[PDB]
């Protein structure tokens, strides 16, 4: 009943940008000071994974 559109989830971009900028520094402690790290989306396989 009513209009249809896909289900979705909203995450504020400023908070997520800050959270990534805070996790990247904790990750550099194990993988190098003044180095670059990347993260793309999932590889593939199970839908639940």
């Amino acid at each position, epitope marked *: *009943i*009513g*209009d249809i*559109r896909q289900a*979705h989830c909203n995450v504020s971009k400023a908070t997520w940008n800050e959270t990534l900028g805070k996790v990247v520094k904790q990750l550099r402690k194990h993988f190098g000071n003044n180095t670059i790290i990347r993260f793309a989306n999932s590889s593939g396989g199970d839908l639940e994974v």
Partner: antibody
Amino acid sequence: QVQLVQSGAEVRKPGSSVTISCKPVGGTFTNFAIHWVRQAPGQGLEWVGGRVPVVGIYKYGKKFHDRLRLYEDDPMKTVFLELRSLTSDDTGVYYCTRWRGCGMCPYDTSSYYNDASDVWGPGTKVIVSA
Amino acid sequence: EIVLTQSPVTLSLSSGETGTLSCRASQNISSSWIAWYQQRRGQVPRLLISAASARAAGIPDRFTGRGSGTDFTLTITRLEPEDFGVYSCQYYGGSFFTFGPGTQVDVKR
């Protein structure tokens, strides 16, 4: 781009009731509100009522209480106007009006009612004459 | 209630001539609840300007809208024989919409 398609003209006896359909084509159904603007033959435009289709946000004119009833039918995606106790004053052309906006933005689940009307139905000529 | 009035009942204009229609409100209203409509020869009304200044989709440059508080004006710098007919102003703010009585324009002669 959206479009409004109404019913054909009708003739009703005084004191009876009339029901007019209006089906939008190619647009969001539950967002913007459907207002009804009528024009008595030779006079200015008169606002009848307005109603968000499914949400129910509606309000009729002061002149049309105990005679007007706006409803809809989402299986057919068509709104309806019902006017009772017809007099020769109620003769005229009834318009189905609506606002259209953005179109690309789909995540808007809200309901709007205080808007103008750029999308107009061709009109439905209601003639009250016994 | 909120009722609107239109002053220049019949406004005569030739080609290139400039006119100014008025729409006075009873109370003080916001400058975001006034629209202007064009109605040519008993056909479908076309929304000219929303929010008393926002020119609608495809409406030409010849239609400029102004107004604040009580009086709202619609200025037509130039006009073709295309845009002739009855102009109406609508208050679309509160829970009760109300239109202006209409104002017809003539080919000045």
